[PDB]
Design a protein around this ligand. Structure first.
Ligand SMILES: CC[C@H](C)[C@@H]1NC(=O)[C@@H](NC[C@@H](O)[C@H](Cc2ccccc2)NC(=O)OC(C)(C)C)Cc2ccc(cc2)OCCCNC1=O
Lengths: 99, 99
């Protein structure tokens, strides 16, 4: 679909058999999801954005469905105000910026 | 034009007579520009990202040219590692997400 930016580009995603709202973020290199239990092992990691660095759990090869479109990649779980779908997954579903 | 997300969507912008490289961020409610001496009255403001909040100076009605596309709106100036063009200005240049 074609999404305008008058409102936050929030879409429903399915991760770990659970439905959640996530923000399509072209400014984010990675995908950061709120605290939740995801199957498989995880490795401690640190990422940084506008107001500093945070500690996150890194889960690899996690299947994520974004608006019916499939993607399998790295998902970071940590303290975030909103679920963020970054460029690592956006590229998998062929998302592009147009104007 | 059509911008892919293989790399960070960085484009050239013109603000206050200067040319800068800025990141097209659909996940940003506001536009945040690196520290610079813009004339005019400003209002103190605090914006939050991943990691926390930072103090910024709010300037209204600032004309910004994005990739040759004219726009004008609120620009926040503060300690940011990258210049960020948010939805407030992206909507003005007819930018959309497509997949
Ligand atoms: C300037 C950023 C903008 C002000 C802020 N948006 C954002 O910061 C959104 N995009 C993240 C992008 O703005 C930054 C850009 C950046 C790149 C490199 C170094 C530093 C910063 N990327 C970024 O944080 O990447 C991560 C998530 C993988 C760590 C994500 C988000 C959304 C809502 C949030 C908090 C965070 O909380 C909701 C409040 C509104 N916050 C916002 O709209």
């Amino acid at each position: 679909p074609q999404i305008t930016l008058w409102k936050r580009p929030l879409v429903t995603i399915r991760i770990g058999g659970q439905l959640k709202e996530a923000l399509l973020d072209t400014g984010a290199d990675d995908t950061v999801i709120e605290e939740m239990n995801l199957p498989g092992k995880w490795k401690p990691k640190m990422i940084g954005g506008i107001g500093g660095f945070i500690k996150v759990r890194q889960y690899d090869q996690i299947p994520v469905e974004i608006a019916g479109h499939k993607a399998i990649g790295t998902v970071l779980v940590g303290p975030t105000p909103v679920n963020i779908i970054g460029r690592n997954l956006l590229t998998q579903i062929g998302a592009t910026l147009n104007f």
